[PDB]
């Protein structure tokens with residue numbers, strides 16, 4: 202029995218991202234997995250890190266420090282409920298898939314806000330208790346990303362550099378920092394310019410990969426893997 | 430007579446970030462520069478890329494494609510006023526300074542949202558205006574970032590990798606892509622653990638740097654600069 206959370210960041214259900222999300226739901230559901238989707242846009246998920254995220258007395262009301270106050274709020278159980286709702290989904294999951302279009306070599310801001318607000322100290326990491334000792338150890342994560350740029354554009358000698366370069370802040374700085382083991386990314390390059398057959402092939406490749414996802418091992422999430 | 434825009438992303442005016450922003454305002458104002466600050470949290474700036482960003486008739490009401498719709502809205506002058514207000518500030522500026530704390534090896538979500546929503550096709554880049562030919566060519570950009578981690582953690586073989594590694598999506602994937610020439614980043618490492626005198630040294634380094642900012646040459650914003 203496995204539990205999967207899909208954190209999904211696209212505005213349009215008929216989009217290529219939406220199709221990739223649905224085939225993940227369909228395939229993991231068919232396998233008998235428990236599946237939950239956080240559809241951030243449909244949830245109107247709040248991306249801003251503000252003092253509204255702490256619902257009780259601040260430890261220092263004179264000078265607001267988001268990190269200090271959210272860590273204390275986590276321990277006291279005074280974080281906003283939208284944050285703890287996401288934390289419950291993550292805590293229960295064996296695998297967290299992030300499904301998103303690449304925006305500025307990174308995640309859409311709504312998804313960046315989920316990272317900023319959900320992965321607070323005490324929940325996702327502690328100091329000490331990060332990278333291999335992070336608090337989400339034992340869990341897997343996987344980035345399923347779509348791009349405008351082609352695969353050739355995302356090579357070492359291409360104008361955008363290798364695709365693994367833009368994965369570093371997400372895979373290493375975020376997921377590995379929190380103790381996740383990271384499965385190899387699923388990058389669906391340039392669906393907007395792919396042919397109809399090429400798009401269907403990309404959707405089928407993801408569905409096929411998910412059939413055997415539980416047999417995969419994580420990547421070595423190191424500088425060498427990303428930069429060689 | 431130079432014009433500067435500071436895009437500032439911190440919740441607390443008394444923070445180290447707030448102080449770096451105020452030193453920049455004071456010093457650039459003293460030089461006789463024209464200075465504008467976009468204080469994103471005070472503006473409650475919207476980070477989400479949604480259909481509310483277009484005020485006109487959608488080019489395709491059946492299927493929402495954020496990039497297509499914003500490109501068309503830019504051309505038809507029907508973007509939301511919060512976006513067009515920011516575009517005016519950028520259009521007028523000779524230098525754009527981004528002042529932020531590092532969140533998950535990147536910008537806080539509110540600032541990511543400014544990038545996502547302000548830098549639309551037609552305004553910041555197009556086919557074929559990108560990288561050196563980007564539409565904001567002629568302008569300078571500078572990242573002034575504060576970190577939790579120490580300089581030693583941000584080395585090639587340190588736990589976090591070189592700081593240049595996390596700069597790639599921001600400096601290259603975003604600023605260079607839009608045609609900015611990128612001035613060397615200002616990285617203020619670990620002010621929360623630094624001594625009083627170290628903090629003062631880091632602020633003064635920034636104030637002093639700002640005295641000669643117009644004499645600087647841009648970095649070569651290449652994969653080699655970042656990873657080599």
Ligand SMILES: Cc1cc2nc3c(=O)[nH]c(=O)nc-3n(C[C@H](O)[C@H](O)[C@H](O)COP(=O)(O)OP(=O)(O)OC[C@H]3O[C@@H](n4cnc5c(N)ncnc54)[C@H](O)[C@@H]3O)c2cc1C
Pocket residue numbers: 211215216217218219220301302303304305306307347348349350351392393397400401404478494495496544545546602
């Ligand atoms: C703010 C912003 C920043 C960006 N920054 C970057 C960047 O830094 N680097 C980069 O490379 N790109 C960037 N892009 C481009 C972006 O990554 C792509 O536009 C996006 O990944 C395309 O995915 P989509 O789901 O929106 O595609 P869609 O336009 O929804 O899909 C493309 C086509 O596939 C079709 N389709 C949907 N489902 C199926 C299916 N099941 N089978 C067959 N076809 C199907 C759709 O109908 C459509 O015709 C950026 C875009 C924006 C808006």
Ligand SMILES: Cc1cc2nc3c(=O)[nH]c(=O)nc-3n(C[C@H](O)[C@H](O)[C@H](O)COP(=O)(O)OP(=O)(O)OC[C@H]3O[C@@H](n4cnc5c(N)ncnc54)[C@H](O)[C@@H]3O)c2cc1C
Pocket residue numbers: 250266267268316317318374439443444445446447448529530531532533534535575576577578579620621625628629632
């Ligand atoms: C969601 C989140 C994600 C994060 N991700 C990362 C990450 O990926 N990598 C990483 O390294 N860090 C990360 N951090 C830590 C973050 O980058 C630092 O906490 C932030 O950079 C500290 O800057 P600050 O302005 O908030 O410091 P502050 O705590 O406001 O300032 C530090 C000290 O300097 C003092 N000070 C202010 N002005 C002056 C002045 N004029 N002269 C002397 N002292 C002054 C303050 O009073 C304070 O005592 C993260 C934090 C959060 C909340």
Ligand SMILES: COc1ccc2c(c1)c(O)c1c3c(ncn32)CC[C@@H]1NCC[N+](C)(C)O
Pocket residue numbers: 305306348349350361393394496497548549550602603606
């Ligand atoms: C670093 O490479 C980028 C950076 C920003 C980008 C893009 C690519 C990119 O391909 C697109 C984009 C947008 N805003 C920022 N970016 C909108 C859409 C876009 N790609 C789709 C357009 N086209 C011509 C494929 O249909």
Ligand SMILES: COc1ccc2c(c1)c(O)c1c3c(ncn32)CC[C@@H]1NCC[N+](C)(C)O
Pocket residue numbers: 268269320321322328374375378533534576577578589621
């Ligand atoms: C990739 O390195 C990280 C990633 C996330 C981090 C931090 C460092 C970091 O130093 C902090 C942090 C927070 N949320 C995510 N992160 C809150 C505060 C924090 N700052 C460290 C110093 N200390 C112990 C004063 O909080």
Ligand SMILES: [Zn+2]
Pocket residue numbers: 372373374377421422423
């Ligand atoms: Zn790693």
Ligand SMILES: [Zn+2]
Pocket residue numbers: 600601602605606649650651652
């Ligand atoms: Zn570059």
